[PDB]
Amino acid sequence: TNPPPPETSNPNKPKRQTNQLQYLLRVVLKTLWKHQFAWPFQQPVDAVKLNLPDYYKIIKTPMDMGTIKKRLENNYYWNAQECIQDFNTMFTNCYIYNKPGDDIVLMAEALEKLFLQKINELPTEETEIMI
Numbered sequence: 001t002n003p004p005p006p007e008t009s010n011p012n013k014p015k016r017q018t019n020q021l022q023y024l025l026r027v028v029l030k031t032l033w034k035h036q037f038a039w040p041f042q043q044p045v046d047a048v049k050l051n052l053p054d055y056y057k058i059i060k061t062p063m064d065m066g067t068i069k070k071r072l073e074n075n076y077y078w079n080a081q082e083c084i085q086d087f088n089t090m091f092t093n094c095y096i097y098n099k100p101g102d103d104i105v106l107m108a109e110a111l112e113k114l115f116l117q118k119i120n121e122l123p124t125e126e127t128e129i130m131i
C-alpha cells in the first residue's frame with residue numbers, strides 16, 4: 001500500500017521565493033533531471049510494484065525529484081537549504097535501504113556527486129523574488 005505522494009502545497013504555511021531557489025529550479029534540477037541515472041528518482045518509489053520489503057517502515061520520509069520539482073514550482077520551500085534537505089533525504093534513503101555497491105546505489109551516488117557540484121554554484125547571498 002503506497003501512501004499518497006508528499007505534499008507539494010502548503011495552504012497554511014509560508015510561500016516564499018529566492019534567487020537561490022531560482023537557481024535550483026532553473027539550473028541544478030535541469031542538469032539533474034537530464035542525467036543518465038535520473039529516471040528512478042523522477043517519481044515516488046513504487047515499493048509495491050517493486051516489492052521492496054518494509055520500505056515505508058524503514059524509510060520514514062519518502063522523497064523524489066518529482067516531488068522536489070513541484071515543490072520548487074509552488075514555492076513550498078522557504079529557503080534553498082530547505083530544498084537541499086529533500087535531496088539529502090532522497091539520496092540517504094537509497095543508501096539506507098540498499099546494499100552498498102548495488103546498481104540503484106551507484107546511480108544515486110553519481111546523481112549525488114553531480115548535485116553537490118551544482119549547488120556549489122548557487123548565489124552566496126540570498127535575495128527575495130517578487131512572488
Ligand SMILES: O=C(NO)c1ccc(-c2csc3c(=O)cc(N4CCOCC4)oc23)cc1
Nearest residue numbers: 039040041045046050052093094097098104
Ligand atoms: O522505474 C524504474 N525502473 O524501470 C525504477 C527503478 C528503481 C527505482 C528506485 C529508486 S530508489 C530505489 C531503492 O531504494 C531500491 C530499489 N531496488 C532495489 C532492489 O531491486 C530492485 C530495485 O528501487 C529504487 C525507481 C524506479
